[PDB]
Every structure is written in C-alpha cells, then in structure tokens.
C-alpha cells in the first residue's frame, strides 16, 4: 500500500499508493511485470529526476488527492522559480 520512489540523488519518498497512482508513467511502472506482495516495497528508481523534484511531485500527489473535488476553494500551489521548469521537465516523465 506504500510504494517507494527512489530519486537519482538517492532520497526515497515513500508515499501512499493511491497518491502515487495519479501519474500515468508511475501507473505503468507499478503495473507491468510484477507487483510484489502488498506493494510493501514496490521500489522504482527514477534515475534521472532530481530529489527536490521528486519531493515536489509527491507534494503535488498529496495536493491533488486532497483537492480533487474539494469544493471551489483550493490553496495555491507554491512554486519557486528555481524549482520550476525542471519540475515540468520531469512532469513529462511523471505525466499527470
């Protein structure tokens, strides 16, 4: 139920599976050959994206799960200019 996300920088960002199943590429990566038992490890090594981008995309996963239809008031997602661009450059590879 808790999948593991390994960055290229070595930092793991284990998040809830339902939070991590909103990315189509992660949807395919968890599927395909094998799903382990209970997805207790279910590790995937995103050997290209940086660690801060992986942290930001896990934050976005939580954000989207919390505010998928949460009325009309939704908090603004804070994005630093230095952490942008590469967040979207990796949002390709983590198509949401």
């Amino acid at each position: 139920m808790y999948v593991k996300l390994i960055s290229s920088d070595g930092h793991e960002f284990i998040v809830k599976r339902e939070h991590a199943l909103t990315s189509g590429t992660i949807k395919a990566m968890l599927s395909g050959p094998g799903q382990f038992a209970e997805n207790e490890t279910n590790e995937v090594n995103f050997r290209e994206i940086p660690s801060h981008v992986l942290s930001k995309v896990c934050m976005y996963f939580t954000y989207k799960v919390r505010y998928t239809n949460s009325s009309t008031e939704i908090p603004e997602f804070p994005i630093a200019p230095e952490i942008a661009l590469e967040l979207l450059m990796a949002a390709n590879f983590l198509d949401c």
Partner: protein, 143 residues
C-alpha cells in the same frame, strides 16, 4: 544528468529496448530496475535533440512486432495438429505482452503519436490481426 534532450545514441538504447521488450512480449521475467531504466530510455528517445526520434522508434518497434508475430505464425503453422492450443498459448502471451508494452510506451503513446499513426498497443494488436489471424484464418475457423 537531468531530463534534458541529451542527443542519445540510438544504437545501444534501441538494443537495450529490444532485449527488454522481447522479454516483455515473451512474458519472461525482467528486472524492475531495468524496466524503469527502459522507461528513462524511452523518454530519452522521444525527446533528444535535434529531432525527435519518435517516428524512428515507432517504425523500429513496428518492424520488431511484425517479425515477432510472423515468427509466432510460423511456429503455430508448423504445429499442425495443435494449431488451436498453440494459438491460444501465443495469444495469451502476446496479449499480456501487448498490454505491458503499451504501458511501457505510454509517454510515446500520448506525447508523439497522438500529436496519423496508431497507439503501440493498438499497433501490436493490429499486427497480430494482420499477420497471425488474417493468414491463419481458414484453418482456425475450420478447427
């Protein structure tokens, strides 16, 4: 080494992809880490400068799929008495391989082909239809 278009070499990447998707379409156990590395290689191939290699990759995997389907057709036609059982076994294997491959080619499926061509899973099923059940039609329906 971030997700920049790095102008990746097509030869080694396509060979690694060939091995991995051969294992996938043959339903052979494949390493999870190598599977994720092949995802990274697909993203490298569909983006690298100065031109996208998506059409080249699409034609290459089209050729791979058609020769694999034709090889399976030859095997099934050779297995004359158990054509039906062999066709069912290879159909289960190829359908699972086609779904897993369409999962692997997801970025290429929804970033280049959509923007004429057909989806990689649709292409795999179409190749199976046009090269396995289209030639081996009368034998299958009679059996």
């Amino acid at each position: 080494t971030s997700l920049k278009p790095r102008v990746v070499d097509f030869d080694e990447t396509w060979n690694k992809l060939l091995t991995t998707i051969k294992a996938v379409v043959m339903l052979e156990y494949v390493e999870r880490a190598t599977w994720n590395d092949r995802f990274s290689d697909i993203y490298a191939l569909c983006v690298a400068y100065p031109e996208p290699l998506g059409e080249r990759l699409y034609t290459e995997t089209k050729i791979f799929l058609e020769n694999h389907v034709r090889h399976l057709h030859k095997r099934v036609l050779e297995s004359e008495e158990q054509v039906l059982v062999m066709y069912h076994r290879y159909w289960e294997e190829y359908s699972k391989g086609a779904d897993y491959m369409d999962c692997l080619y997801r970025y290429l499926n929804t970033q280049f082909i959509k923007k004429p061509l057909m989806e990689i899973g649709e292409l795999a099923l179409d190749m199976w239809r046009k090269l396995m059940v289209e030639p081996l039609q009368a034998i299958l329906i009679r059996m």
